[PDB]
């Protein structure tokens, strides 16, 4: 859906191809920069499937990108500080292949603490073996596979949503005093939540 959206895998991407690389221009004395997956997601999204499987040598780069939004390269006779303003949608399998509900999120996955720290949202999708949910899922899947082109009545076409997203991204909302007080109270309550235990501290 999203333009400037780049999808990758766990171990299928190396460091250079995932962040950046440098080659020398074949026609002059200057050097050109091969843009890695992170860069192509600039002002977009990077979808890292099987994140937990990614090598540490690459996870350090992803952590750097999340930290300062930028990639610093000193290679092949050229230095550069390039911009990577990308959001990261990661998909990580729980350690052991199944999510264990009797542990904190820190233990259920093999992500380093710095990586998890700067993830704004963690969504846990446990496969509760409920019959109603299974019936609904089966109905939807079979309806999809029976009626391929139809059966999808989306109120807004993907092109319309793309245009609306591109227009709305330009807005820079303010924070009024009332909203500031509401944020303060909500944060107070959310911290009080952590006073049973939660999947991870707040």
């Amino acid at each position: 859906f999203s333009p400037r959206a780049v999808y990758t895998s766990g171990k299928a991407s190396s460091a250079a191809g995932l962040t950046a690389a440098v080659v020398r221009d074949e026609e002059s004395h200057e050097f050109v920069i091969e843009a890695g997956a992170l860069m192509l997601a600039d002002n977009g999204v990077c979808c890292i499937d099987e994140f937990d499987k990614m090598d540490v040598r690459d996870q350090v780069a992803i952590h750097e990108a999340m930290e300062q939004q930028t990639i610093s390269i000193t290679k092949a006779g050229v230095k550069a500080t390039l911009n990577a303003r990308t959001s990261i949608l990661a998909a990580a399998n729980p350690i052991s292949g199944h999510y264990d509900r009797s542990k904190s999120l820190k233990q259920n996955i093999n992500l380093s603490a710095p990586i998890m720290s700067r993830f704004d949202l963690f969504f846990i999708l446990v496969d509760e073996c409920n019959e109603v949910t299974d019936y609904a899922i089966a109905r939807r899947i079979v309806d999809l596979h029976s009626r391929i082109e139809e059966s999808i009545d989306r109120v807004y076409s993907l092109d319309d949503i793309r245009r609306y997203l591109l227009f709305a991204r330009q807005f820079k909302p303010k924070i009024s005093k009332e909203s500031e007080d509401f944020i303060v109270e909500q944060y107070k309550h959310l911290r009080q939540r952590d006073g049973t235990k939660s999947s991870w501290r707040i």
Binding site: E27, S28, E67, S72, A76, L82, R191, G195
Partner: protein, 649 residues
Amino acid sequence: DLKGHSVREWVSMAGPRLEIHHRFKNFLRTHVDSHGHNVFKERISDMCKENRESLVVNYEDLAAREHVLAYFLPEAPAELLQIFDEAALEVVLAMYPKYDRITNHIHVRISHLPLVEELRSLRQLHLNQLIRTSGVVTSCTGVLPQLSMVKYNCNKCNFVLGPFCQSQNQEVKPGSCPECQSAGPFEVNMEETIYQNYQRIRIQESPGKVAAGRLPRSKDAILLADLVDSCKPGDEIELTGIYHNNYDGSLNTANGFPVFATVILANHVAKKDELTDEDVKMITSLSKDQQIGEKIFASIAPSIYGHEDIKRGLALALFGGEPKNPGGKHKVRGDINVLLCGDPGTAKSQFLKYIEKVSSRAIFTTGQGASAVGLTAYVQRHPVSREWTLEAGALVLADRGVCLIDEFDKMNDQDRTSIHEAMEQQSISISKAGIVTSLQARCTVIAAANPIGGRYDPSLTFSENVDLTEPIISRFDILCVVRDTVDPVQDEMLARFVVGSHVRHHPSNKGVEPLPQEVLKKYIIYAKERVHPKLNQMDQDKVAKMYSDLRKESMATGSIPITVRHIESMIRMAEAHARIHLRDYVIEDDVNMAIRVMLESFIDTQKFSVMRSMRKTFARYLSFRRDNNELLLFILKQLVAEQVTYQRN
């Protein structure tokens, strides 16, 4: 004077050439100011006085007084600028006839050019024109000596040949020597030749200016004989220069298209961004405030709320102690290393970054490899310079400054060994390729770390809930245990702080008084460089009794004991606190404050039960300069928290 067929050819003619020459001379003489009568008078005076051999000329005034010359300028920069140099030389001689002995030449630099472009907007249309751009210097070579006025030496008849002025476009080829009429090889004659400094830099688009789906572009520039060393890598610079193209650049080589490389002949450089006098009065003026200690302790990382004790420790680390080596066989470091161990989300990295920002010769590195410079030394060919250099470890780079180490508990084995060596012996020993050397790194290490398991548990002593061996922790003078404990009042206050910061830094809108940061660093410089307190007034009786009591108490329980190095650290912190006040003699209150800080750290390093044991046993020491309100508020908060826990269980 719009007339003719070609602008460059128009200036080429002798007539308009001399017309422009004399008009520019008259402009230099006559253009005075709105009120600064004859700015160029004092300009030339100062330049000659310091022997600067340069003249920065604003474009606005030149266009105002002589619009024709300003219009001609960008179209054919080479000829107009050469004429301006010729004019300014004789103008200077008229003002300073003797100065003719100095450089026999004057360069004219032009600034505030009206139209400013970006490296991505450069096109063939801009060839051979004065253009103003902005960018980050991404690489810069040494000050290479380039031939200026060569005198080749004929081999056959050993006759030196006349000066063949070197051109930036083509290499000079000598003819046949006038004497023996030989077209032989010839060789430079360095003793009789004269050169000019030649630096080559690369300027790339500022990342903050690049668009979303685009990559920064870069252009090569040449600085010549006076702009050299005016830039360093990482500088944001406005560069005005000639988009020169015709030197040798044409891909006539096979498997190549008729492309042309481009380099900007630099003509003016402006960096967009501390040895003063009479500021000693300023520093001394508030030095006698009698409460400056609180001011400075509150003037550290003003963007961080609370954590006052950590700020005090960082202030003491900044001002440092007094290194002393009795005889030459007992090396005692004057530094105050600090370790901030705490659960995440408590602004430890913020403190480290503030110290990076506020302290000169301060470098930042991380336990991970995400830092520009590593902790360990090595030797290699630098990737950008391609030159074989000894990359000294980060600690060495901060030889007399501050090394900030984030993720202190995620280092490598070799990184741990290197930090141990630096902290222990204050030097690094390298034997990597053939360099058997020992270079000293007298750095103050300020480290940040998280407890094992991501949460600090007071039921366990400090040394066991941190992924650091005892020898490493034993070399830190202050241990700050930052704990994130749920507290509604503090939570609300911090929420207000950060949300207000977010409000105030929106793009559209872009109990003492803390000192301004610039004055704070001036004070730090003066204190750290001039005042060297001596502890001739320390009460040995009090310190000895305190140490003996602490030994007895710590050994009375199964707790980490107090050792001599703790007394050493207390001495260093007392000297640092005296340095803050520039007393030049440690006073009883300085010693008491140092004892307070050292005991606070040592107590907080203990387990939960021993924490209260030593708090009650030494509450007198730990309460120095701690007014009644603070203790009463702490006790009330403890009681109300106990009530809350009883309520919600």
